[PDB]
Design a protein around this ligand. Structure first.
Ligand code: NAP
Ligand code: XJB
Length: 163
């Protein structure tokens, strides 16, 4: 099982300026609950975007997809392709692809599940933004109710499974 997990604004922005242009603690908790104890696969930009307190992501096997020989920032296992990231895999569990846009595009054809957090923040896309992948007719989804964060932002979760 290969799952994509991401958070996006309603407009479909996932990234800006090498980071994420909102703060939503409830989504961080959701992300940790779904990924704890599992392998997480990310693109190298996302690895370099992690604040030092969160790099590597604790309690997870951190796999970084890069074309470079290796990385200056410690704690990752580097691989040269998504296929190398995904095999061998943890039994009875999902391997989670955790971004960013380039790595989501690589993984989308291989994925069985998507776990999306939608954040109701008004973020018209800007020219260098990373955008969420668009899902096609091979996905069936369900959506949770709108929730209110302690910061006042509304958010909700969507879950998709391959037909
Ligand atoms: N909202 C969310 O859920 C979420 C989640 C994660 C990230 N983000 C955001 O997304 C943005 C980063 O996304 P991004 O698309 O710019 O970068 P990315 O997908 O994180 O990383 C891109 C890098 O991955 C490597 N790569 C890409 N394709 C490859 C291939 N075919 N083979 C081997 N290596 C490959 C390259 O690393 P090298 O250059 O080292 O070769 C490339 O520069 C940031 O703003 C981050 O904060 C948002
Ligand atoms: C607080 O910033 C968050 C940024 C992104 C999400 C997030 N949310 C969903 N739903 N899917 C994702 N792929 C996703 O990005 C995961 C990779 C980036 O992770 C970062 C970045 C900065 C600080 C901390 C962490 C995780 C720390 C940990 O997990 O210990 C969550 C919170």
């Amino acid at each position: 099982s290969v799952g994509l997990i991401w958070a996006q604004s309603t407009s479909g922005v996932i990234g800006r300026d090498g980071g994420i242009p909102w703060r939503l603690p409830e989504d961080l908790a959701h992300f940790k609950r779904l990924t704890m104890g599992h392998t997480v696969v990310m693109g190298r930009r996302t690895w370099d975007s992690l604040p030092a307190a969160h790099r590597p992501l604790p309690g997870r096997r951190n796999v970084v997809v890069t074309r470079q020989t290796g990385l200056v920032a410690h704690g990752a296992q580097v691989v040269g392709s998504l296929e190398q990231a995904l095999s061998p895999a943890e039994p009875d569990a999902a391997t989670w692809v955790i971004g960013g846009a380039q790595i989501y595009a690589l993984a989308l054809p291989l994925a069985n599940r998507c776990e999306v957090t939608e954040v109701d923040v008004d973020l018209p896309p800007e020219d260098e933004d990373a955008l969420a992948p668009v899902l096609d007719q091979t996905w069936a989804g369900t959506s949770g109710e709108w929730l209110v964060s302690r910061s006042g932002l509304r958010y909700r979760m969507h879950s998709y499974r391959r037909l």
